C-alpha cells in the first residue's frame, strides 16, 4: 500500500517569497527552501 | 525423469453393482506428489484421485 | 573470382535455354563483348580474358567483368562413382546464355577496343562479338 | 492508440465477434456519454430485428447531469428492449457486451433483460 498523506506538514518558505507563496505538506518538515542559483 | 504413475479413487469394495478400483495412469511426477480430481469413477462424480 | 559465403555447399547442374529478353543492352563502358553461344564460363577464363584486355589497354579505359560466376561445379575422384561427397571446392562457373554481355570497356579509342576485345574473345570458350554502346 | 477509446472499444468488439462468436439472434449495446443504444439483430438477414435506445425512455424519464449511462437508466433500457421482445417472440438472445467489460451498468442491462423472461 504505502500511503503517504501528502498534505499536512509541508515546509518550503524561501528567502524571497511571492515567487514561493505556496507550501505543501507531506512527510517533510523544514519550512525553509534555499535560494540557490539566483 | 518422467516416470509413469497411476491414480486411484476411493475403493469401497462392495456387493453393489460392480463397484471396483478405478485406476487412471498419468505421467510426469518429478516433484512432490500430485493428486487430481479425474472423475467419472464407478460412482459418477469424483474428487481427489491420489497416488 | 568466387563468392565469399557458401550458402549451400553443392548445387546440381542446370541447362541453357536461349535468351529472349534481358539482352543486357549496355550499362557501363562503351564497347561490350556480347556472347552468342550458350555455355558455361569458369572463373579462370574470366581471369584470362581480364588480363588480356587490361594489359592490352594498358594506357586508359576501364574494364568491366559484367558477370560473376556464383555457381559451383564438382568433380569426383576415380572411385567408381559411388557417392558425390566432396567436389564443390573445385571451380566455380557462370552460366552465360545468348544475347548476354561478358565485358564492357570505355575510355578506349575504337580500334584499340577492337584488339582488346578480339584478343579477349580468343581466350574464351564461345563465339562472341564486340558491340558498341548504341 | 491515438483513438485509444476508439481503437480500443471498436477492436475489443471485433474480439467479441471473433471468438465469442454471437451469430444467431444477437443483442448488442452501445453506451455513449449521452445515451445507450441496444439492438437485437440477426446475422442471416443482417437487419436489426428489434432495437431500443435512450431515445425512447427519455421520452418519459432521464437525467442529463448524470452520465447518460447510469445503472438505473440502463435498468430501464433493458426494461424496454425486454418488454419489446417480451412480445415479439424471441426467447433466447445471444447477448454481447459491445466491448465494454461486463461489470458495471451493462450488468444492469443484462439483468434487466433477464428478469423479464429472456432466456439468456
Amino acid at each position: 500500500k504505502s500511503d503517504i498523506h501528502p498534505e499536512f506538514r509541508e515546509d518550503a518558505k524561501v528567502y524571497c517569497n511571492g515567487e514561493l507563496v505556496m507550501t505543501t505538506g507531506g512527510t517533510q518538515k523544514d519550512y525553509t527552501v534555499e535560494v540557490w542559483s539566483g | 525423469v518422467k516416470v509413469i504413475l497411476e491414480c486411484t479413487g476411493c475403493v469401497r469394495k462392495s456387493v453393489n453393482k460392480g463397484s471396483r478400483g478405478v485406476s487412471r495412469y498419468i505421467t510426469q511426477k518429478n516433484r512432490h506428489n500430485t493428486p487430481s480430481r479425474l472423475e467419472l469413477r464407478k460412482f459418477c462424480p469424483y474428487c481427489y484421485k491420489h497416488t | 573470382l568466387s563468392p565469399k559465403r557458401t550458402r549451400f555447399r553443392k548445387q546440381h547442374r542446370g541447362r541453357m535455354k536461349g535468351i529472349s529478353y534481358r539482352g543486357n543492352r549496355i550499362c557501363f563502358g562503351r564497347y561490350a563483348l556480347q556472347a552468342l553461344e550458350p555455355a558455361w564460363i569458369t572463373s579462370r577464363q574470366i581471369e584470362a580474358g581480364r588480363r588480356a584486355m587490361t594489359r592490352n589497354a594498358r594506357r586508359g579505359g576501364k574494364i568491366w567483368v559484367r558477370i560473376f560466376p556464383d555457381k559451383p561445379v564438382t568433380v569426383r575422384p576415380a572411385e567408381t562413382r559411388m557417392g558425390s561427397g566432396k567436389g564443390s571446392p573445385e571451380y566455380w562457373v557462370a552460366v552465360v546464355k545468348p544475347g548476354r554481355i561478358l565485358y564492357e570497356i570505355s575510355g578506349v579509342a575504337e580500334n584499340i577496343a577492337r584488339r582488346a576485345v578480339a584478343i579477349a574473345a580468343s581466350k574464351m570458350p564461345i563465339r562472341t562479338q564486340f558491340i558498341i554502346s548504341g | 492508440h491515438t483513438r485509444r477509446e476508439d481503437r480500443t472499444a471498436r477492436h475489443v468488439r471485433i474480439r467479441k465477434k471473433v471468438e465469442g462468436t454471437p451469430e444467431r439472434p444477437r443483442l448488442c449495446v452501445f453506451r455513449s456519454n449521452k445515451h445507450l443504444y441496444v439492438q437485437v439483430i440477426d446475422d442471416t438477414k443482417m437487419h436489426t430485428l428489434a432495437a431500443a435506445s435512450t431515445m425512447q425512455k427519455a421520452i418519459s424519464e432521464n437525467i442529463d447531469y448524470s452520465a447518460g449511462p447510469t445503472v438505473e437508466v440502463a435498468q430501464k433500457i433493458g426494461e424496454m428492449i425486454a418488454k419489446s421482445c417480451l412480445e415479439k417472440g424471441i426467447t433466447k438472445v445471444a447477448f454481447d457486451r459491445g466491448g465494454y467489460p461486463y461489470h458495471g451498468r451493462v450488468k444492469a442491462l443484462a439483468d434487466a433483460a433477464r428478469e423479464h423472461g429472456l432466456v439468456f
Binding site: 503517504i4 518550503a12 512527510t27 517533510q28 523544514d30 527552501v33 534555499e34 540557490w36 | - | - | -
Partner: protein, 175 residues
C-alpha cells in the same frame, strides 16, 4: 500546489504566444516516471527492499520491480531477473514531486550547469530525463554506500523542442 496558478496564470501566456485557436492544444506536463537501474537486485534482496523503501518514500506511491526484457549472457540475467525499479507516477502527485524537485533538487545539487535545452529535449515528443542526484534531505542519506542509476522522464502534448523546456522555465527549472 503548482497546479492551480499553472492553470490560470501561465496558460494565457502560451495561448497568446503560439496564437492558437483552442486552449485545447496547449501543452501540459502529462506524466513523469522515476526509475532506479540496479546492477544486481537479484542477489541483493534487501536491495530490492531498498528500492521498495526508498523509492516508495521519496515519490508518491509504491515502486514497480522491473523484469528483464530479454536475457544477457555473462551476467545473471534471465528473462525476468529484476534489474530496474520504477514508479509510473502521474495525476497530481506528479505536480507535488516535480515540485519537490524544483524545491529540493534544484537547491541541493553541487554541480550546476542547470538544464541544457537541446540536451535531453530531443524527440518526436518530449522525453526529458535526468541522471543522478537521487538522494534527498528527507531520507536519511548516510545508509547508501554505492552508486545506482535513475531516470526522471516526462511527456507533453506539444511537439516543439522548447515549449516543454519553456514549460520547465515557466516553472522552477531554468539554468
Amino acid at each position: 500546489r503548482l497546479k492551480t496558478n499553472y492553470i490560470e496564470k501561465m496558460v494565457p501566456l502560451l495561448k497568446e504566444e503560439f496564437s492558437y485557436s483552442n486552449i485545447l492544444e496547449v501543452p501540459k506536463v502529462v506524466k513523469i516516471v522515476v526509475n532506479c537501474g540496479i546492477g544486481d537486485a537479484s542477489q541483493n534482496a534487501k536491495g530490492l527492499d531498498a528500492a521498495i523503501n526508498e523509492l516508495a518514500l521519496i515519490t508518491g506511491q509504491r515502486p514497480v520491480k522491473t523484469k528483464a526484457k530479454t536475457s544477457i549472457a555473462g551476467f545473471k540475467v534471465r528473462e525476468g531477473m529484476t534489474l530496474g525499479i520504477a514508479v509510473t507516477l502521474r495525476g497530481n502527485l506528479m505536480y507535488s514531486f516535480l515540485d519537490r524537485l524544483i524545491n529540493l533538487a534544484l537547491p541541493r545539487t553541487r554541480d550546476f550547469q542547470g538544464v541544457n535545452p537541446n540536451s535531453f529535449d530531443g524527440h518526436g515528443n518530449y522525453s526529458v530525463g535526468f541522471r543522478e542526484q537521487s538522494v534527498f534531505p528527507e531520507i536519511k542519506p548516510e545508509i547508501v554506500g554505492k552508486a545506482r542509476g535513475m531516470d526522471v522522464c516526462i511527456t507533453t502534448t506539444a511537439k516543439t523542442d522548447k515549449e516543454a523546456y519553456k514549460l520547465l522555465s515557466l516553472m522552477g527549472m531554468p539554468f
